[PDB]
Design an enzyme around this catalytic site. Structure first.
Site, PDB file in Angstrom:
ATOM      1  N   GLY A   1      23.368 -22.198  17.111  1.00  0.00           N
ATOM      2  CA  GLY A   1      24.373 -21.323  16.521  1.00  0.00           C
ATOM      3  C   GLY A   1      25.616 -22.106  16.157  1.00  0.00           C
ATOM      4  N   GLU A   2      26.688 -21.411  15.763  1.00  0.00           N
ATOM      5  CA  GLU A   2      27.952 -22.087  15.510  1.00  0.00           C
ATOM      6  C   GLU A   2      29.201 -21.382  16.029  1.00  0.00           C
ATOM      7  OE1 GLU A   2      29.399 -23.390  11.685  1.00  0.00           O
ATOM      8  OE2 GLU A   2      27.542 -22.753  10.681  1.00  0.00           O
TER       9      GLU A   2
ATOM     10  N   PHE B   1      34.353 -23.112  17.479  1.00  0.00           N
ATOM     11  CA  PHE B   1      34.641 -24.544  17.647  1.00  0.00           C
ATOM     12  C   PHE B   1      33.558 -25.561  17.268  1.00  0.00           C
ATOM     13  CE2 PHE B   1      38.562 -22.803  18.845  1.00  0.00           C
ATOM     14  CZ  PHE B   1      38.327 -21.817  19.780  1.00  0.00           C
ATOM     15  N   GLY B   2      32.758 -25.198  16.271  1.00  0.00           N
ATOM     16  CA  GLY B   2      31.713 -26.060  15.745  1.00  0.00           C
ATOM     17  C   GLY B   2      30.311 -25.560  15.990  1.00  0.00           C
ATOM     18  N   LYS B   3      29.351 -26.307  15.464  1.00  0.00           N
ATOM     19  CA  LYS B   3      27.942 -26.010  15.602  1.00  0.00           C
ATOM     20  C   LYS B   3      27.470 -26.396  16.990  1.00  0.00           C
ATOM     21  CE  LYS B   3      26.917 -26.733  10.677  1.00  0.00           C
ATOM     22  NZ  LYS B   3      26.056 -25.554  10.381  1.00  0.00           N
TER      23      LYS B   3
ATOM     24  N   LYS C   1      27.708 -29.329  21.604  1.00  0.00           N
ATOM     25  CA  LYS C   1      28.681 -28.776  20.668  1.00  0.00           C
ATOM     26  C   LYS C   1      29.258 -29.934  19.884  1.00  0.00           C
ATOM     27  CE  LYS C   1      32.826 -27.191  22.077  1.00  0.00           C
ATOM     28  NZ  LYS C   1      34.116 -26.425  22.143  1.00  0.00           N
TER      29      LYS C   1
ATOM     30  N   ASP D   1      38.424 -14.269  27.757  1.00  0.00           N
ATOM     31  CA  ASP D   1      37.442 -13.684  26.825  1.00  0.00           C
ATOM     32  C   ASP D   1      36.128 -13.399  27.525  1.00  0.00           C
ATOM     33  OD1 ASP D   1      36.349 -12.492  24.563  1.00  0.00           O
ATOM     34  OD2 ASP D   1      36.010 -14.401  23.492  1.00  0.00           O
TER      35      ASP D   1
ATOM     36  N   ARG E   1      28.598 -11.606  25.466  1.00  0.00           N
ATOM     37  CA  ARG E   1      28.286 -12.604  24.417  1.00  0.00           C
ATOM     38  C   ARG E   1      28.671 -14.026  24.884  1.00  0.00           C
ATOM     39  NH1 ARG E   1      33.682 -12.832  22.724  1.00  0.00           N
ATOM     40  NH2 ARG E   1      34.524 -10.722  22.992  1.00  0.00           N
ATOM     41  N   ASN E   2      29.588 -14.123  25.876  1.00  0.00           N
ATOM     42  CA  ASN E   2      30.027 -15.396  26.451  1.00  0.00           C
ATOM     43  C   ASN E   2      29.290 -15.790  27.725  1.00  0.00           C
ATOM     44  OD1 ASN E   2      31.744 -16.372  24.405  1.00  0.00           O
ATOM     45  ND2 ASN E   2      33.488 -15.192  25.199  1.00  0.00           N
TER      46      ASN E   2
ATOM     47  N   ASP F   1      32.164 -19.854  27.337  1.00  0.00           N
ATOM     48  CA  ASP F   1      33.138 -19.330  26.365  1.00  0.00           C
ATOM     49  C   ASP F   1      32.788 -20.032  25.062  1.00  0.00           C
ATOM     50  OD1 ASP F   1      35.324 -18.628  24.763  1.00  0.00           O
ATOM     51  OD2 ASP F   1      36.828 -19.044  26.320  1.00  0.00           O
TER      52      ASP F   1
END
Ligand SMILES: CC(C)n1cc(C(=O)c2ccnc(NC(=O)Nc3ccc(F)cc3F)c2)c2c(N)ncnc21
Length: 277
Positions: A29-30, A33-35, A56, A152, A156-157, A170
């Site tokens: 995924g991406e 903060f990047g792929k 990452k 956060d 999803r995290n 995160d």
């Protein structure tokens, strides 16, 4: 970016991994903060020749993002707990800069809940939902002990690994998970994290539904500021809804402590209550 963590001081150094020891497989995924790539990492653990990792790749150069990358790596190396994503180190030789984490095979907890609704496929039972909740609470007890404010927390995290092991990470405002003081005054504390944990407990018991799903972003901001509470999920026993309500006290100082929330979930997970919707 990481100024709120200034009181946290690193002991030792960040682990460095040689670039040639990382072999990229495919993008996982991406986001922010990047792929993120699935990769094989060599010479990391003395017992295994190669192992799977999530990598990452930093997008910027920058050199403001480079200073932030070093501080982020110093903070992640400090986090060592059974229920916090495991950070292996960085690769700083050339571009892009890389961060390496232990791979969690079942991916993010939100997608996991949504795909195991009403690994072993099928619906998660009450015992399993309580085990997920207890594990996220255990990670949050660890962060609170370190005076690390996550800011956060959401399913999803979180990540799911072999044998339903759940860990907090995160991956990149999350208004629907925030209490009024965070939305209005940008006050992020151990107490706003416990409120977000109550919303994570609601996500777990609705099998990953979005909080305030019936409302627009603007309507949700207004409802949280006015003090309306999320409804009890159909799969949620009364004992568990009482935990959610304890996390959602309007006054931050009245919210239940994460240690007590975790202990209550432990008791219920090792039980569980005889409840049928
Ligand atoms: C869902 C997919 C794409 N995915 C992401 C994986 C990561 O581990 C990953 C990706 C990018 N940044 C972080 N950063 C981090 O977690 N920081 C952090 C941790 C604890 C904390 F309290 C605060 C923090 F900021 C980690 C990942 C995996 N390991 N396995 C499978 N999929 C993964």
């Amino acid at each position: 970016m990481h100024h709120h963590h200034h009181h946290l001081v690193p002991r030792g150094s960040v682990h460095h991994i040689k670039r040639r020891d990382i072999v990229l497989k495919w993008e996982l995924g991406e986001g922010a903060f990047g792929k993120v790539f699935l990769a094989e990492c060599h010479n990391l653990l003395p017992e295994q020749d190669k192992m799977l990792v999530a990598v990452k790749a930093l997008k910027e150069a920058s050199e403001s993002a480079r200073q932030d990358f070093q501080r982020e790596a110093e903070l992640l190396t400090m986090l060592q707990h059974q229920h916090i994503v495991r950070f292996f180190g960085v690769c700083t030789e050339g571009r892009p800069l890389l961060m390496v984490f232990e791979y969690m095979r079942h991916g993010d907890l939100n997608r996991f809940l949504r795909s195991h609704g009403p690994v072993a496929p099928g619906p998660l039972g009450l015992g399993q939902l309580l085990a997920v909740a207890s594990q996220v609470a255990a990670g949050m007890v660890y962060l609170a002990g370190l005076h690390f404010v996550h800011r956060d927390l959401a399913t999803r995290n979180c990540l799911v690994g072999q044998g339903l092991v759940v860990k907090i990470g995160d991956f990149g405002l999350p208004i629907r998970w925030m209490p009024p003081e965070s939305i209005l005054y940008r006050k992020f504390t151990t107490e706003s994290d416990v409120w977000s944990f109550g919303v994570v407990l609601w996500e777990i018991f609705t099998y990953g539904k979005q909080p305030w799903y019936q409302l627009s972003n603007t309507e949700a901001i207004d409802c949280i500021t006015q003090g309306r509470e999320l409804e009890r999920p159909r799969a949620c026993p009364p004992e568990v809804y009482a935990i959610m309500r304890g996390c959602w006290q309007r006054e931050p100082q009245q919210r239940h402590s994460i240690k007590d929330v975790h202990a209550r979930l432990q008791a219920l997970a090792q039980a569980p209550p005889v409840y049928l919707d």
